[PDB]
Amino acid sequence: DKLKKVLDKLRLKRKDISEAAETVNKVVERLLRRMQKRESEFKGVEQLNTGSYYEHVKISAPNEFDVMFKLEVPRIELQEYYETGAFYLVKFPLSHFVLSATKMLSKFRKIIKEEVKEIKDIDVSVEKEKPGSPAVTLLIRNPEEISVDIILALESKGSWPISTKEGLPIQGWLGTKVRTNLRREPFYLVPKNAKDGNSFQGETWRLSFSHTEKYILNNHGIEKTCCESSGAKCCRKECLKLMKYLLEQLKKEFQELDAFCSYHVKTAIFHMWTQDPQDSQWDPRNLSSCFDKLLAFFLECLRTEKLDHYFIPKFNLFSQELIDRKSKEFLSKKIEYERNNGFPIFDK
Amino acid sequence: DKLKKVLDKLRLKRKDISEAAETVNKVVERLLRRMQKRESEFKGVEQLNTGSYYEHVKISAPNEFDVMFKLEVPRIELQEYYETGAFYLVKFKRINPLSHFLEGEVLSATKMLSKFRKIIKEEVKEIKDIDVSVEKEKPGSPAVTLLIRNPEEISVDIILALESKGSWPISTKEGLPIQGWLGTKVRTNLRREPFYLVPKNAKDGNSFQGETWRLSFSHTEKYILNNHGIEKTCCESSGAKCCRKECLKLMKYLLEQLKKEFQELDAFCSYHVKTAIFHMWTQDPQDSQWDPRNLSSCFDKLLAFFLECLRTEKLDHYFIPKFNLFSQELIDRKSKEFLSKKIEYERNNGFPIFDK
DNA sequence: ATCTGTACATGTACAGAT
DNA sequence: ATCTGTACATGTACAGAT
DNA sequence: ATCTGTACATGTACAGAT
DNA sequence: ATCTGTACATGTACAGAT
Ligand SMILES: Nc1ncnc2c1ncn2[C@H]1C[C@H](O)[C@@H](COP(=O)(O)OP(=O)(O)OP(=O)(O)O)O1
Ligand SMILES: Nc1ncnc2c1ncn2[C@H]1C[C@H](O)[C@@H](COP(=O)(O)OP(=O)(O)OP(=O)(O)O)O1
Ligand SMILES: [Mg+2]
Ligand SMILES: [Mg+2]
Ligand SMILES: [Zn+2]
Ligand SMILES: [Zn+2]
């Protein structure tokens, strides 16, 4: 009854979805046109929508949209940066860019920013660039505030990089056929736009599997009929929404939680879904246990400082390198706290 | 245990699989290549392997292969033949290498199949590598059948097909009722795939005899047989084994053995058993109603279901609901009651026909 | 010199074999 | 329980053509 | 090569029935 | 309270035409 009532609150309204979509769609379609019918280095860029709005796990409002502009590049040689798993250098139109991530992002951003100056019917500007974000972010204003991330991506049609050989461990959940077919899809690369000063900073790209993640979110049962009109509904997505909301609310309240992001929750629940594959373990009537064993799984990840990338097993999103220890026990007490008092933060 | 051992007899041997595939593939590759040559009307034809050997339900010996030579035919218009659901006239809206088979707008099936057949015959003459002849044409069959004598005997049905990429013909709207078993996304995807038309090729002196085509969904049946569980891991190396294909194999064998002894059964064919089990799989969607430890019971309910279809004279095509393969129009009641008796007799007496 | 239908190259599920 | 031939889907190369 | 048209998935919203 | 059935809305895949 409690968690159900929070999910009613988190539910997007049909009207809000329509108003945001037609304005987001107007901007994106025009932006896509410039990079094409104009003689840019990005002629051939194709649009692939990603993230929580398109996975139907957006909460609260339709105010954040993520779009990948992906560009096929033939026979690129990858070269893994210092064994990290997820970061690579790229080698062999694009001549003006070893292919520089920053050099290519800047021209892309230049093109976007120019075309936004020519938009006269929508209140839209280009947010100032952020370190560590490969996106060019639009800030739109219907009366309400909407944010669009335009992510630049390379598309390689080759065998996936060796670092993912043990990745995507869906074999007992979605199976070997699904896994083999998914690994036949392209894979993508996006700028590592960190501004730390470390060595190969400006030429490093990151592996992206947002297209695989979207398929999983929408094909998430061991039974083919899970959540379909002739199957049984499960509560896998509601748990992800609840865990996203609890992290959102904690991040509003505490600046110490700044190094956490919803992707950490997304990754943790891919692992849960793999360890509890049966749809009956995500039955709607057990929403509380499910949310709770998700909380405990997430605290075990904090306590051991271990949360491996679902596709890149050796890449630990929870290493000392990315999140100082103390940041983690801060989140652990805060989370054990909400847990052991019936989630007060959910009433605000 | 009794049925486990039948399956052991029925299992194909890798050695045989090997010697038979090496030959069969040689011939088919050579026939396909000749269809791309010169000013061939069939240039562009593409190969699709179908049937029980590629579904992995071929029993006893790998001695019968089925292959589809399908030709994409755009800008195509269908006239259902007399409300039968399965049979169609094919018309074109433009005036094409197929023109030599047109009869003002209407695409002649027997003319096309005849030209196809003459080419296979001519290319088989040039094969001096293996003992292989073209079997005398069989009425009702769209196939061109090769008999290969690699010591052992081997049949290959080369089926000629039109490939259309449009949405499926409305007589299938209510077909393929897999929503509760493989689900709606699977169904939507399957129905985006092409559909196929093969020559009906009967010689019954009925109107439009030589211009009637028949819907075929062999490619969809291939997908279903190799993706047959409600659970995605069914029969996979990290999932649980089921006995769905093992029931099919036992049913096919019972029919095969009886058909081998009793001429009364000429009207029957493995497609009848294959259809019945598609319905049984829809009736019982859960993989747990096909546990391997339940083989004798699973096989038994499939037999009961088949007897009911026989007795009530109703076995609806899985894809075309209004097309009844057990109508009086296609099989005498005496044919059906005869098979009913033999099935009931096998069932209530230890399946003595398995030991033959 | 560049283009492209044909076919080799690669990876793996399925299932027989040891 | 692992090793292994066939089938099949998709990436890529290049002799022969433009 | 680009774009429209079609089909049905995923949602939200709400009355009527359990 | 929840389940079921209809209406309403967007997202996405791809056939066919221009
Ligand atoms: N593949 C990734 N690797 C690292 N960080 C990521 C990745 N994907 C997303 N993030 C981070 C970026 C942002 O800080 C945060 C949310 O970004 P976003 O792309 O909008 O995700 P999302 O759409 O799945 O969830 P949300 O509901 O928060 O919008 O997650
Ligand atoms: N769609 C169909 N409609 C009518 N009869 C069919 C159909 N498909 C096959 N048949 C008939 C043709 C043969 O007489 C019999 C088996 O044909 P075939 O294509 O070899 O089937 P199969 O490969 O699935 O089974 P088998 O193991 O007996 O070869 O069924
Ligand atoms: Mg989002
Ligand atoms: Mg066969
Ligand atoms: Zn579900
Ligand atoms: Zn199975």
Q: Which of B258, B242, B249, B260 minimizes the C-alpha distance to B310?
A: B258
Cβ–Cβ below 8 Å for A229 and B184? yes
Instruction: Determine the 3-state secondary structure of A98 from DSSP.
Output: coil
Among the bound ligands, name the one nearest to the CA of residue A188: 1
Q: What is the DSSP letter of A316?
A: B
Let me know: does A79 contact A13? Beta carbons within 8 Å: no
Distance A92 CA to ligand 3 centre (A): 34
Q: Which of B169, B180, B176, B161 minimizes the C-alpha distance to B107?
A: B161
| Cα gap A300→B87, rounded to integer Å | 63
Amino acid at A156: S
Whose alpha carbon is nearest atom 30 of ligand 1?
A263
Distance set, CA B280 to CA B96, B174, B177, B309 (Å): 44, 17, 12, 12
B141, B218, B270, best to mutate for ligand 2 pocket (most atoms within 8 Å of CB): B270
How many residues are given for chain A?
A: 348
CA-angle at A283, arms to A226 and A247, nearest 5°? 100
**Which residue numbers of A have CB closer than 8 Å to B's CBs?**
171-178, 219, 221-225, 228-231
* CB-CB neighbours of B73 under 10 Å: 18
- Find which nucleotide's C1' atom is closest to B239's CA: C13
Let me know: does B7 contact B135? Beta carbons within 8 Å: no
Instruction: Determine the 3-state secondary structure of A21 from DSSP.
Output: helix
Let me know: does A105 contact A206? Beta carbons within 8 Å: no
For chain A, where are the E strands, in sequence order? Answer: 46-50, 64-72, 77-80, 87-91, 123-126, 135-141, 145-156, 187-191, 205-208
**A79-106 burial by CB neighbour count: b if 16+ within 10 A, else e?**
eebeebbbbbbbeeebeebebbbeebbe
Amino acid at B154: I
Cβ–Cβ below 8 Å for A219 and B179? no
Signed CA dihedral, A9, A14, A19, A20: sign only: positive
Residues of chain A by 3-state class (helix, strand, coil), percent to 5: 45, 15, 40
Let me know: does B244 contact B252? Beta carbons within 8 Å: no
CA-angle at B219, arms to B214 and B220, nearest 5°? 95
Q: Which of B4, B62, B74, B32 minimizes the C-alpha distance to B247?
A: B4
Which residues contact residue A86 at a Cβ distance below 8 angstroms, ignoring those fewer than 6 apart? A163, A206, A207, A309, A312, A315
Q: Which of A175, A228, A231 lies at the smallest CB-CB distance from B232?
A: A175
For A9-141, where are the E strands, in sequence order? Answer: 46-50, 64-72, 77-80, 87-91, 123-126, 135-141
| Cα gap B325→B309, rounded to integer Å | 10
Amino acid at B31: L
* CB-CB neighbours of B179 under 10 Å: 17
Let me know: does B97 contact B43? Beta carbons within 8 Å: yes
| Cα gap A164→A312, rounded to integer Å | 5
With a 7 Å cutoff on the CB, does A177 touch strand C? yes
Under 8 Å CB pairs connecting chains A and B tally to 60
- The strand pairing partners of A192, in sequence order, are none
| Cα gap B232→A111, rounded to integer Å | 45
A189, A261, A316, best to mutate for ligand 1 pocket (most atoms within 8 Å of CB): A261
Q: For B121, how many CA atoms within 13 A lie in the half-sphere containing its CB?
A: 10
| Cα gap B191→B173, rounded to integer Å | 10
Cβ–Cβ below 8 Å for B233 and A222? yes
Annotated binding residues of B, as ranges? 50, 52, 64, 66, 140, 157, 200, 214-221, 228, 234-235, 242, 252, 270-274
Here the tokens at position A127 are 């947010």
- Domain locations along chain A: 2-12+160-186+209-348, 13-159+187-208
* CB-CB neighbours of A66 under 10 Å: 20
Distance B273 CA to ligand 2 centre (A): 10
Which residues contact residue B113 at a Cβ distance below 8 angstroms, ignoring those fewer than 6 apart? B142, B144, B160, B199, B201
Cβ–Cβ below 8 Å for B238 and A171? yes
- The strand pairing partners of B164, in sequence order, are B195
Among the bound ligands, name the one nearest to the CA of residue A279: 5
Residue nearest to nucleotide C13 (CA to C1'): A177
- The strand pairing partners of B288, in sequence order, are none
For residue A309 and ligand 1, the question of a CB distance below 6 A is answered with no
Cα end-to-end distance, chain B, whole Å: 18
Separation of CA B217 from chain center: 8
Enumerate helices (H) and strands (E) in chain B, giving the number of each.
10, 11
